[PDB]
Structure formats: structure tokens, C-alpha cells
Write a protein that binds this ligand. Sequence first.
Ligand SMILES: Nc1ncnc2c1ncn2[C@@H]1O[C@H](COP(=O)(O)OP(=O)(O)O)[C@@H](O)[C@H]1O
Ligand SMILES: [Mg+2]
Length: 354
Amino acid sequence: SSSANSIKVVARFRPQNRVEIESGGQPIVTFQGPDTCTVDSKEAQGSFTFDRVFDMSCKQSDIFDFSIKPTVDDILNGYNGTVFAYGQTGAGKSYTMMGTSIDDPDGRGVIPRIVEQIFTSILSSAANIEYTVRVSYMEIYMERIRDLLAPQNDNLPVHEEKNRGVYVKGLLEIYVSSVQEVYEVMRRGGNARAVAATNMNQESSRSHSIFVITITQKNVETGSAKSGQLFLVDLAGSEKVGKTGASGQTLEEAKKINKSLSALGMVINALTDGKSSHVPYRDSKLTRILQESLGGNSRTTLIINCSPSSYNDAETLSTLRFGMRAKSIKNKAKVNAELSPAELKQMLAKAKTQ
Ligand SMILES: Nc1ncnc2c1ncn2[C@@H]1O[C@H](COP(=O)(O)OP(=O)(O)O)[C@@H](O)[C@H]1O
Ligand SMILES: [Mg+2]
């Protein structure tokens, strides 16, 4: 499947919230198939079809079992991937990625469920396959990278080499040998995020959070070893900045519009246009770090979080369309994992009989 490596887009509608409900908000979204929805409102109207659409009744386990679980199998097999949670503030990005509390069984989101599955597979693997797992947790705000596991470092640099790709130099990576150790890592990172949001004059809705899991596996009988990494991204709010509606700071720092949550849109536009191979990954550190996830070597899933309320019809339409544009993007289908071959040949040479 060299072309079936398209970006998966799933839409998730949460129930209306208090402000919508008590402001005269009404449902404007109807569901057709398990992959289609229809909006009918003053500033909406339209029919959209994605790889999957979850209605207001769908629970956390549904999200995971119907569109995320397959991703864990990919990383466990040496493939790289990324899962994005996109949408306006209050749409359900964090709830979907981390959940209300990772300690509330029903309310826990994608990430903790991914970790459980990873350790469950590892533990049931043949003694012949030895695994290693390590995590990183960072936050990007105003184009500055903060290590949520080593908070003092709040301006980490981004580096890049031909023989390695893009990485954050100095980012702490912690080996974890159990579901419990990783869970505490998630709690620590959450704590660090609240600290920044509370004491650093930083808008929590305008920062991106990235959880990185890297799994290495070695077949001790063949001496062959490979790895796969998964980036779990909770993006900043996608609503229009307008520098007029939330008490804007200095008009300069209002470079918010230029930020990654804009660089992401420009990157998506360029890829869907396809007339130029010069995609603007550099417009932001987010898009540089995740450049392979957009048009490169990666199994990518985009979760667009939407409100089903007429109160937020305009933003929900903007989000759906964005999701529609990302849908037509095809990712690079090269470099599998273990030798079998994982395809039909995978030996790009030329001839060289000698
Ligand atoms: N699908 C859902 N079901 C029930 N409550 C939800 C759901 N999705 C989101 N919420 C609630 O949404 C409110 C704000 O959502 P949040 O996930 O913080 O989203 P965002 O990060 O996109 O701002 C929270 O109090 C959250 O628990
Ligand atoms: Mg959030």
C-alpha cells in the first residue's frame, strides 16, 4: 500500500457545553453513515465525509478502538506516526488526547490507552523480541519549546541533520518500563503545563503540547533492530485571532497569526496544491518537528474536534473544511521496518552484479 498512505481524518462532535446550551445553542449536525455528517445552520450548511465521524454519544473507548488502536500496531512494527487533535478552544482536543483525568477509567483519553496497549503487546511478545520504550513531553508557546519533564528548559533549540531528521536538542527522554511509570510522566507534564499557564503570562489555548513515544525492538536471534515513534499532538486553538477579542498584548507578540497554528494551515495548503515541493515547514517549530507527518514518511491521523452547536457554527465549518483539505494529502510511502521484505523487494539499487 504505497498510495493507501493517505492522511486519515476523523471528526468528533462533543455534546453542547454549558455556554452554548444556555446561550440558545441548538444542534445543527446530522449523521448519515459512519463516515458522514451534515451541518445546517445560519453560517454553516454543507455535507462532509471523512474516514470516520463520531457523534455526541461516542465514548473514549470508541475513539480508540475505531481509529487509534491500529496506530499502536504500526509503531510496534517499526513505523512512525502522528496523531493530531485539531479544533477551536473548548472543542475537546485535550479531552480526546489525555482525557478528563487519566485516572478516571471511562474519561481517560487516547494517549493513556495507547500506552496500555503498548505494554500489553510488549509483555505478551516472544522472549526473542526485546523492547525499549522512551517518552518525551514538550510544550510550544510563542515559538519557544519547553520540556514538560524538565520545565527549567523553556527555550530548547530545534536541530536537523541528513542522517537523522529533525529533533529537539536537549529534550529529556525517559525510559519507562511499565504503564505506571509512563502515567506518572503524564501527570508530571500536566502539572508543568498548569504551572506555565498560571505563572508565565501564557495563554493555555494558544500553546501546542507534544507527547513523544519511541519504541525500539531488537530480534536477538537475527541481531536486527528497528524503531518506530509516535507523536501525540494537542494543538493550540484554531479559532480566528483577530487581535481583537481577548485583550491583545503588544501588537508585536501578536505574531500569533504567524505561529505554527497558521504554519500548519500553510503547510496543508501547499501540499494539497502540489505545484511546489517547497512546503513551508520552517514557518514554525511545530511544522519542522512534525514535517514528516505532513507529506512524508508517516502514518498520520488528524482528529478534528467540533461543537455541534449553532452557537459555534462558523468555527465548526472552518474546522470541517480544514479537515476536508487535509484529507486529500498523500504521505510518503518509503522505508518499512524489519527485513522480510516488508513489501515485494525494497532493495533500491540499480544492478551492481559485482
Ligand atoms: N466528548 C466529550 N464528552 C463530554 N465532555 C467533553 C467532551 N469533549 C470535551 N468535553 C469537555 O470539554 C470541556 C473543554 O474541552 P477540552 O478538551 O479542554 O478541549 P480543548 O482542549 O479543545 O479546549 C471540558 O470540561 C471537557 O471535559
Ligand atoms: Mg486543551
